[PDB]
Amino acid sequence: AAAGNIKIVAYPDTNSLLVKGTAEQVHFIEMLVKALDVAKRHVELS
Amino acid sequence: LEEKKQATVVSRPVLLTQENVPAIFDNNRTFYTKLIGERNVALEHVTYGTMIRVLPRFSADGQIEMSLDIEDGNDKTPQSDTTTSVDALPEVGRTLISTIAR
């Protein structure tokens, strides 16, 4: 369909996203999320 | 005069919660004052004390990441002999920390 009928709702109770769309748009957001989800490093400032 | 001094203080708050649930521990003190107005007469108050607000979360490896908001305050006292010890002047000193650790 279109890019304007995708609904994204935060569910903080299990720390997860809820995406509603077609079977090709759900796989499209799942590949974007795994690129924005990386582990961070610690900085100590003195 | 010849003076020596030493002072140690170790304080520890403990709090229990679940994953992805915000929790609050609070141990404060309230100071009420009488603002003698005529229209919008009100009891104004200040508040100071120990306070933690945490949001724990387990990572994929088994480590615990937290979103912290720590406040530790107490009441600083000026000289007791002068008149400003009887009015509404509790000089408050606080210590605020807001960060994220894992």
From Swiss-Prot, chain B:
It comes from Salmonella typhimurium (strain LT2 / SGSC1412 / ATCC 700720). Disruption phenotype: Insertion mutants are hypoinvasive in the HEp-2 cell assay. The chain holds residues 359 to 460 of 562 of the full protein. Belongs to the bacterial secretin family. T3SS SctC subfamily. Component of the type III secretion system (T3SS), also called injectisome, which is used to inject bacterial effector proteins into eukaryotic host cells. Forms a ring-shaped multimeric structure with an apparent central pore in the outer membrane. This is SPI-1 type 3 secretion system secretin. It comes from the Bacteria. The core secretion machinery of the T3SS is composed of approximately 20 different proteins, including cytoplasmic components, a base, an export apparatus and a needle. This subunit is part of the base, which anchors the injectisome in the bacterial cell envelope. Forms a stable homooligomeric complex. The complex is composed of 15 subunits. It is found in: Cell outer membrane.
